[PDB]
Subunit: 144 residues, 3 copies
């Protein structure tokens, strides 16, 4: 009825604002949304900002999701932090839920745990991953 008309007018308007939101610091892949803050921070600060924002750090679980996140990295020309760490068990990277990686896109020779102190993961402009020290400043990208 009349209400049914109100909602279809709403999805129309909402879909337009979805597009407006993701410009220029957002990327949607499936039902997941990546958004970057535009600046660089250490892991702990990046993880904090993302969690208080109601989400978490970028967690690519597929090639499609990895490609979408990659576009933000290319656009900002800055390697970004991922949520996965091997702090608990060295060599074994896990999501915040604790489960093991269901997808990875390591660069050649990575992860190498360089200096025996590389426990966080970053993504380059080519979409490849590298384990890097969590104290380094990288692009803050959250997922919602």
């Amino acid at each position: 009825e009349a209400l049914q008309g109100q909602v279809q007018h709403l999805q129309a308007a909402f879909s337009q604002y979805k597009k407006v939101e993701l410009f220029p610091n957002g990327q949607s892949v499936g039902e997941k949304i990546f958004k970057t803050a535009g600046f660089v921070k250490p892991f702990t600060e990046a993880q904090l900002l993302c969690t208080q924002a109601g989400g978490q750090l970028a967690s690519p679980r597929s090639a499609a999701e990895n490609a979408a996140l990659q576009q933000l990295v290319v656009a900002k020309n800055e390697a970004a932090f991922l949520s996965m760490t091997d702090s608990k068990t060295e060599g074994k990277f896990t999501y915040p839920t604790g489960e093991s990686l269901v997808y990875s896109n390591w660069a050649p020779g990575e992860p190498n745990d360089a200096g025996g102190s590389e426990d966080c993961v970053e993504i380059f402009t080519n979409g490849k991953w590298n384990d890097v020290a969590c104290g380094e400043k990288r692009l803050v990208v959250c997922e919602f």
Copy 2:
């Protein structure tokens, strides 16, 4: 249709979260959002009103703390909407009513030089009456 509205709040709640990052803060049904730049009061008041809202007007300790976070993130003191321009010494909201909450810094308000009618909020959340001509961070509320 009944399912579609339930599907809609789900998407909207997600878009809600995406929107407020990283320049927004929600406290209750109020939303603080910063422009990222500094302006004199008249321009700040202007930009917020044309945007469909008004300058940041914290009415509780919770709201003041949320607004404070936007200030800390930008490392820039921000303008509030309240002024004692009409009646000196008595600061009021745009509606004209008196302050229902205040967090003045020690010794403030002092009306320094006899020409301080606007209010700014520091990175520590404390308030200070400052000249309206000064450039401070633009933070609106919606």
Copy 3:
């Protein structure tokens, strides 16, 4: 349920307002949003298209004035979507149709050096055909 859906329009209308501040402008059913930075035409045109829209395409004085404010706010001339790349002298929208509105500055378009095929908009709302390789403000429309 009807109360629940109108409660949704209320929340969306608020987030509508939050979204457009401070880099957005809505005129009619069109939304202009700026990226805040400058890029060459091809890069600007690219960013807009992958974002789900296209470059700023003012079709009326009302739309042109709204786009103008983003330019004023950033103090940087912005690229429009219209070009005379196909047939020199004949500017067209991405759809291929001829201009239904123009606000050319005095003496424009002049195709200076025989190599000006893109259009920029100044802080005064006037248009100028300029070389597409130049870096201008990126403003898209949705």
